[PDB]
RNA sequence: AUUGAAAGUUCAAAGCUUAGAUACCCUGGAGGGAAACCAGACUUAACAC
């Protein structure tokens, strides 16, 4: 099963508060980055249970169909303008 | 003009007394919340050429 042993946010949450931004992801470069349409791209450190074989990243980045159906599993439009604690933003970005 | 005439089978009298529709008796036995079903379909737009 998929186990996310840890993900080192608390830096993405910083640059998110009081704003309404779309948090895009990208997994090429072998390190998970978290693009923000509010013009910042924080590289995310994480440890998972699945080892993406470095062939799968390329198979998804090259196949224009895969990278197209990947738009739906890639982003959230987080709205922190109103009351927005850090913990629930953590769970949002974690999921 | 008769072995006749005359003569109320009448009177008094409670179908009453005692007496538990009760005794025994499992709504139980048998019986699959199952049958069918794709987490899938597809790229498009823009300008450059």
Query: Which positions on strand B lie below 7 Å from a protein C-beta?
Result: 41-43
A79 touches strand B (CB under 7 A): no
CB A93 within 8 A of CB A36: no
Report the nucleotide nearest the CA of residue A65, measured to C1'.
Answer: B43
Tokens 């998804």: give the residue.
A60
A65 touches strand B (CB under 7 A): yes
Residue A29: phi and psi, rounded to 5, are: 80, 5
Distance in angstroms (rounded) separating the CA atoms of residues A79 and A71? 19
CA of A36 to C1' of B5 (A): 156
Give the experimental resolution in Å.
2.4
Angle at A48 between CA A45 and CA A51, to 5 degrees: 105
Q: What experiment produced this structure?
A: cryo-EM
């Amino acid at each position: 099963r998929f186990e996310l042993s840890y993900v080192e946010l608390d830096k993405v949450i910083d640059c998110l508060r009081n704003y309404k931004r779309k948090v895009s992801l990208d997994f090429i470069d072998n390190t998970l980055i978290a693009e923000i349409e509010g013009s910042t791209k924080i590289p995310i450190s994480f440890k998972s249970n699945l080892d993406i074989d470095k062939i799968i990243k390329d198979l998804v980045h090259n196949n224009k169909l895969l990278s197209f159906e990947l738009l739906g599993f890639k982003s959230v439009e987080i709205d922190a303008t109103k009351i927005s604690d850090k913990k629930i933003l953590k769970e949002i970005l974690r999921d």
